[PDB]
Symmetry: C3
Subunit: 260 residues, 3 copies
């Protein structure tokens, strides 16, 4: 029975792990302060909705990363027969424990933050309610089935079946970003900025399922420490710089996005 | 003590249980493909909202049933003194384990899918936001208190108290379906189709608390495998057939439901 | 180790704890009946939306208190080194068990009920969607980070860090309540009733983080039983009397909240 304290201490004493986590807690906090400063001039309710949705991204990130750092949202799971990480062991407390240190808490970071990123993008693109609803519901389904895949230890094949379902949901979100909102942004007069944020988002988001496949959750070419840093690097771009670019535009183009 | 693998293997090797779960994974998948194909011609935003809300039903179902088949959302619980399934055994891994294989994952299938069924129906009936909000919130309360009932092992009476709270929430949903939306559909011009789907929905949904009461969660006249098939059969009609019928109407009457979201 | 039945019995057989839980189950139930009766004459859809949102408060409360009374949402946690409740015992069943009985179920009562309180108040004040969204999202964040604080056992300081994050989110909600909705209510013609409900909400809500700090979750000057009654008393006011007052006004001013 691994304790929360043992996982908290495990993160510590492990350079790659501890740094990938605490650096994001710090960047998330600094991002929030910066973004609040940047948007104090906004008055339009719609511009402010986009701003708050955007600021909620680093808010969810600081809370969720603290969930990981504290050990609260970390568990030790034993992979099923055939899985590349099956047979692995980790030193926890004063004994060797079978399994993999599983940072399932990252899925909470994703399920709560990705909907805010999508809401901000859709509002920016002048999306109607149907498309926002579709993008957000399928995005949440993608995140939850991804968590289910990571939490499945009964069967190797089942883990990848979950992965396939999640990818299917991801395709829906990608279609809306690349095809529908890309067109809607033209009518909203935000075609240029949306194009930039869209490219950034699509490229970075595609990185997550790749890291999943290569990291300990997948074929394990990337160890627990590198897997964590891979995800943390993606978050810095998909969340913090994405948010800065969006807000930097918003604070200089409040008139453009003002509306009902 | 009991592992996910042991539960996964228990489901496999158990013909009734295995089939009740995997057949729905298959039917939900085929439903998604069929529904996406059927609705490819839709252009109106409101019509498309009704379409996506309906399609989300089998999407939630396939994911949720995978949760059950994989063993992820199944647990072994020991019923409280006096419960008709108290003292049951299950044989897992290789030994006899006290308790009942509890497929609590079904409550997730319900909590995430029923709001979508209701959203689709409310929109079809031309419901205002107040009634949709009321129907959906009490519907979620119904499924969550139902899950709590199944997860309660401390007291037999408590299990049924949760069941009673859930039933009361169910009454709110039934009232909205039978009284409010029944009338709203006439103004929306969808009276014939809504009344039909309203009736099909009410009849099938009534089956769930009956199965709960008769199954292993209740008086246990229905063993685990039979309780599972009862729910899976209800799901096939309340979800897949229901959705197929709604989409059939939708794709031939886009203009009728078109308008401001 | 500790079973649900053992926690269920711990609550029973303890006059203080049992009364603090079962009384609210009774009051919540009676409140639902009373409120439904009180609002049976409403016809306006906007007024009805405010009424349902309000009625959901005691609905969530009766379900959540049943979660606690049944033992379903209670756990036994061992506090970290430095915590004032470290090395505590309880006697679960008939044995001496290390740790403190943690009624984390209360956070569920809060995360699901507070958004409904805020939705009702925001609508009464004639708030736009942006402010409602901001108040509700940060309110949920406050509740979830508070839950995380209570569930954290890896570090004593980590618990207070979660507490700090939660307080920051609370300030956002307080700002909207005290500054923004105070103004909106004037234009909506509900300034007088809002002032009353606003005052009651702010004063009562401020009490929760105080009880947290003083109870077993914090410095532990208040035993498990007194911590429970403190929250239960706050709930009676922040929920039931608050709801009654709002509904009493609502039914007497249906036309004003309707708009036209
Ligand atoms: C939490 C619970 C039950 C939930 C709710 C109850 C009781 C009543 C809800 C009534 C409603 C929603 C009326 C809708 C109207 C609007 C209608 C519309 C807009 C749609 O047209 C309006 C104007 C809002 O009123 C369980 C038990 C709660 C309480 C008790 C005492 C249970 C006891 C059980 C046993 C077994 C003894
Ligand atoms: C395993 C779960 C995966 C299910 C994937 C099916 C989702 C179908 C969503 O509908 C489609 O959404 C597009 C973007 O909004 C519309 O352009 C298109 O017309 C509509 O048909
Ligand atoms: C429609 C959803 C698709 C998921 C299909 C999952 C079924 C895979 C079952 O695998 C088998 O399980 C046995 C018992 O655990 C092992 O002994 C055996 O070695 C393994 O190969
Ligand atoms: C609306 C549906 C009706 C549900 C009725 C539920 C009745 C079940 C009561 O349980 C029994 O209560 C006794 C006293 O508390 C216990 O001594 C006994 O062990 C326990 O099994
Ligand atoms: C809608 C379904 C109705 C549910 C009815 C549940 C009744 C359960 C009856 O069980 C019995 O209760 C006795 C106490 O009264 C116990 O002493 C006895 O051991 C127990 O077996
Ligand atoms: C408002 C609804 C609240 C439900 C309250 C349920 C109380 C039922 C208490 O039953 C008793 O519990 C003891 C401890 O487990 C058993 O030893 C005893 O045999 C059993 O009869
Ligand atoms: C630990 C997380 C705490 C971070 C809190 C910062 C969130 C910033 C929310 O934006 C602010 O909301 C106010 C009320 O709506 C507006 O009056 C103000 O103009 C706007 O800038
Ligand atoms: C702040 C975090 C962000 C933007 C996270 C994005 C995550 C994804 C796009 C994840 C996608 C996945 C799949 C498509 C397949 C299964 C595994 C996942 C969950 C990694
Ligand atoms: C796809 C699943 C559907 C349509 C499920 C519907 C479920 C219900 C109507 C459940 C109702 C219940 C009660 C009213 C009492 C307590 C037990 C439940 C949860 C089975
Ligand atoms: C019905 C319940 C109500 C109105 C609950 C309100 C709760 C709060 C305002 C809680 C606030 C907290 C903090 C600000 C800090 C950390 C701990 C909490 C969760 C108790």
């Amino acid at each position: 029975e691994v304790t929360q304290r043992e996982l908290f201490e495990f993160v510590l004493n492990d350079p790659l792990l501890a740094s990938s986590l605490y650096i994001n807690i710090a960047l998330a906090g600094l991002s929030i302060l910066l973004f609040v400063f940047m948007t104090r001039g906004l008055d339009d309710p719609r511009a402010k909705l986009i701003a708050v949705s955007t600021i909620l991204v680093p808010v969810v990130s600081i809370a969720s990363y603290t969930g990981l750092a504290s050990g609260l949202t970390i568990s030790v799971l034993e992979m099923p027969a055939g899985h590349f990480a099956e047979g692995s062991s980790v030193m926890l407390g004063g004994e060797e424990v079978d399994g993999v240190v599983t940072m399932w808490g990252r899925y909470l970071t994703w399920a709560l933050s990705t909907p805010m990123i999508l809401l901000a993008l859709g509002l920016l693109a002048g999306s109607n309610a149907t498309k926002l609803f579709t993008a957000i519901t399928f995005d949440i389904a993608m995140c939850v089935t991804g968590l289910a895949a990571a939490l499945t230890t009964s069967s190797h094949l089942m883990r990848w079946f979950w992965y396939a379902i999640s990818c299917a949901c991801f395709i829906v979100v990608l279609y809306i970003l690349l095809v529908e909102w890309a067109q809607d942004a033209k009518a909203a007069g935000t075609a240029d900025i949306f194009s930039t944020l869209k490219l950034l988002t699509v490229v970075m988001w595609l990185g997550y399922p790749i890291v999943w496949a290569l990291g300990v959750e997948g074929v394990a070419v990337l160890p627990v420490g590198y897997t964590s840093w891979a995800y943390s690097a993606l978050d810095i771009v998909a969340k913090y710089i994405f948010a800065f670019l969006l807000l930097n535009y918003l604070t200089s183009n409040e008139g453009v996005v003002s509306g009902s």
